[PDB]
């Protein structure tokens, strides 16, 4: 019944999510910016994006996403 | 299938008109275009 | 007095005979193709190549001017 699933929700499910949350929001910080190498299979531009200046991905993050010519 | 007589019989003359108008509705616009391809 | 003819199973009887006929004709028609087309083809290839001389064939094509390379 409902009591079983409530038990599972408060005993197993939400505690699991709390532990994963603690572990992610402790083992976050920010890590090393990968070195840039202008590999031809990455940073593909066959047509300009339909937003911004055309050269920035939609969730572009200056910290870790280089442009075809390198980090900003 | 059986049917009642036509409520509004279509005589041979009327069919020839129907048929002619039908055929010209396909043939005149397309022919206009094909005849004038060079022009385009 | 007229004698009693067969009255039952006339459609079935026509089918039993004509199905055999159908298979005979269709096999005949297909075997005609094999004879007139496939066997003629086999023969025409074997005869063409039996004493075919590729160099001689080449020299004639050369003499006629067909090649860029010779």
């Amino acid at each position: 019944g409902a009591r079983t699933w409530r038990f599972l929700t408060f005993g197993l499910a939400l505690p699991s999510v709390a532990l994963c949350t603690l572990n992610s929001w402790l083992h976050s910080g920010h890590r090393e910016r990968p070195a840039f190498i202008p590999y031809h299979h990455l940073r593909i531009r066959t047509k300009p994006f339909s937003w911004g200046d055309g050269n920035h991905t939609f969730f572009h993050n200056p910290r870790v996403n280089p442009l075809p010519t390198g980090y900003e | 299938i059986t049917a009642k007589p036509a409520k509004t019989p279509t005589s041979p003359k009327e069919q020839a008109i129907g048929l002619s108008v039908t055929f010209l509705s396909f043939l005149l616009p397309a022919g206009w275009v094909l005849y004038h391809l060079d022009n385009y | 007095a007229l004698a009693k003819p067969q009255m039952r199973g006339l459609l079935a009887r026509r089918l039993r005979f004509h199905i055999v006929g159908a298979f005979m004709v269709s096999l005949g028609f297909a075997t005609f193709y094999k004879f007139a087309v496939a066997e003629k083809r086999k023969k025409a290839y074997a005869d063409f190549y039996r004493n075919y001389d590729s160099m001689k064939d080449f020299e004639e094509m050369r003499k006629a001017g067909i090649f860029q390379s010779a």
């Binding site: 593909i44 | 049917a3 129907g18 039908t22 396909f26 | -």
Partner: protein, 514 residues
């Protein structure tokens, strides 16, 4: 009242009617495109002076005939009109959603027409393979408009498939099992299953093409580690089931037509006809790569696909032999619809058998991308589907309209079309065997005679289409109202009169469970 009835419909008959009208209109567009293809090829040299346009025309021909003529006529038109009647249901399960399946098609068609109006159109083939259909070789809006057209048609048919499956499983009389529904009802259910599974895979592939074109993905671009061949698998995973979707409802209508005009109360071997359609539906998902025997596939894969593809002849042969066995012992009525059905049986068989020729991957090396393939599918698909459509249309016109056609004029129409389609397409086998590529605007001079004849045949079929329009006018012009229809005891769709009232089976049928 007009808007309420024809724009806001929730009525399976009126929706059926809408689909038939749209499908007939689309067929005029598709025939015009076909005539343009055949006029370009009717003599050696260039007519259009523009092969990009030729390619645009070929591509649109195909999409129009497939997505806007055959599918809406067979599933939207005959499906909506007949299925509910044939199981005594008061309408479809989702009669409002049914209306959106209809109304998605004019805008879909508008997107396609837009694609050819902007830039230089989508000259890609109906296959829309990258990289030709990508953003360097087809820069601009045309291909995107084509993709969107297909999304909308896709959604239309997916929702339609949901509606038909639900209706057919859930809305029969409670005593009627699924094996007591007519074959056309089966054929529609099976087609619906195939649409439900196959169109989302197409939607995935064309969405990937969209993102490669506009969001800098590289699913199909080697530079990114992508592969043009992936697009081909996803397209043909849909595309094979699609060719069965195009013929299955025609199989259904053919069973009904052959049965009726043979004077029989039932088709021969009902269970085998059901088994055969289910078998074809299933096998239709495991054969797609016979569309790819020249792309450089592994030998065991070519062997598998050759073998699996040929297996489809078995259940298909069961249907052909069962139609003949329905004819067997019949009081044969040589009505115009019976002529369409007999023509179907013969022309479909010829196209089926050239399919078996192509299934052989070794020979397909030499026939692929030639006119032999074009001949194959114009027999099985073009003529087969079209003959079934014509058959069904003649046969059921009196039910849908309440008026009779002129049977002699309908027979004349059949005869002209039969000459036309054979003259157009039979010589294309020779063109193919002898090496003439498909998708060509002109050809080496050797191929002139067969192209000339083929183009001449195209005009005969034009004449038949023009006559068909006249024949429908004459029926509506003369108004011969239906009186008696025979064999209603095994053709439920007729039993409510011609035309049936807006609402049928308000009171459902009474059927005992003994």
């Amino acid at each position: 009242m007009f808007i309420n009835r024809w724009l806001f419909s929730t009525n399976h008959k009126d929706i059926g009617t809408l689909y038939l009208l749209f499908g007939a209109w689309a067929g005029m567009v598709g025939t015009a495109l076909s005539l343009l293809i055949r006029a370009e090829l009717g003599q050696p040299g260039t007519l259009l002076g523009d092969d990009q346009i030729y390619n645009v025309v070929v591509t649109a021909h195909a999409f129009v005939m497939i997505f806007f003529m055959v599918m809406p006529i067979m599933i939207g038109g005959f499906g909506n009109w007949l299925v509910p009647l044939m199981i005594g249901a008061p309408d479809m399960a989702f009669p409002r959603m049914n209306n959106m399946s209809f109304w998605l098609l004019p805008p879909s068609f508008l997107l396609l027409l837009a694609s050819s109006m902007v830039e230089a159109g989508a000259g890609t083939g109906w296959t829309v393979y990258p990289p030709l259909a990508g953003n360097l070789a087809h820069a601009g809006a045309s291909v995107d408009l084509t993709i969107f057209s297909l999304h909308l048609a896709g959604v239309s048919s997916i929702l339609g498939a949901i509606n038909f499956i639900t209706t057919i499983i859930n809305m029969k009389p409670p005593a009627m099992s699924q094996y007591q529904t007519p074959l056309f009802v089966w054929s529609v259910m099976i087609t619906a299953v195939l649409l439900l599974l196959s169109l989302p895979v197409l939607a995935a592939g064309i969405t990937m093409l969209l993102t490669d074109r506009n969001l800098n993905t590289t699913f199909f671009d080697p530079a990114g580690g992508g592969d043009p061949i992936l697009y081909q698998h996803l397209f043909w995973f849909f595309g094979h089931p699609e060719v069965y979707i195009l013929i299955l409802p025609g199989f259904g209508m053919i069973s009904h037509i052959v049965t009726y005009y043979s004077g029989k109360k039932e088709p021969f071997g009902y269970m085998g006809m059901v088994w055969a359609m289910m078998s074809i539906g299933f096998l239709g998902f495991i054969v797609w790569a016979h569309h790819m025997f020249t792309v450089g596939m592994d030998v065991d894969t070519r062997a598998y696909f050759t073998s699996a593809t040929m297996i489809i002849a078995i259940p298909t042969g069961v249907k052909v032999f069962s139609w003949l066995a329905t004819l067997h012992g019949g009081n044969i009525k040589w009505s115009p619809a019976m002529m369409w059905a007999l023509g179907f049986i013969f022309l479909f068989t010829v196209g089926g058998l050239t399919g078996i020729v192509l299934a052989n991957s070794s020979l397909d090396i030499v026939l692929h991308d030639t006119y032999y393939v074009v001949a194959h599918f114009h027999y099985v698909l073009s003529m087969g589907a079209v003959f079934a459509i014509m058959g069904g249309f003649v046969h059921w016109f009196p039910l849908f309209s309440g008026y009779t056609l002129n049977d002699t004029w309908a027979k004349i129409h059949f005869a002209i079309m039969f000459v036309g389609v054979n003259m157009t397409f039979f010589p294309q086998h020779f063109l193919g065997l002898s090496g003439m590529p498909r998708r060509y605007s002109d050809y080496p001079d050797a191929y002139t005679m067969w192209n000339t004849i083929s183009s001449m045949g195209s005009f005969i079929s034009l004449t038949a289409v023009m006559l068909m329009v006249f024949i429908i006018w004459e029926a509506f012009a003369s108004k011969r109202e239906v009186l008696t229809v025979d064999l209603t005891t095994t053709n439920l769709e007729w039993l409510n009169g011609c035309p049936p009232p807006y609402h049928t089976f308000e009171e459902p049928t009474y059927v005992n469970l003994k």
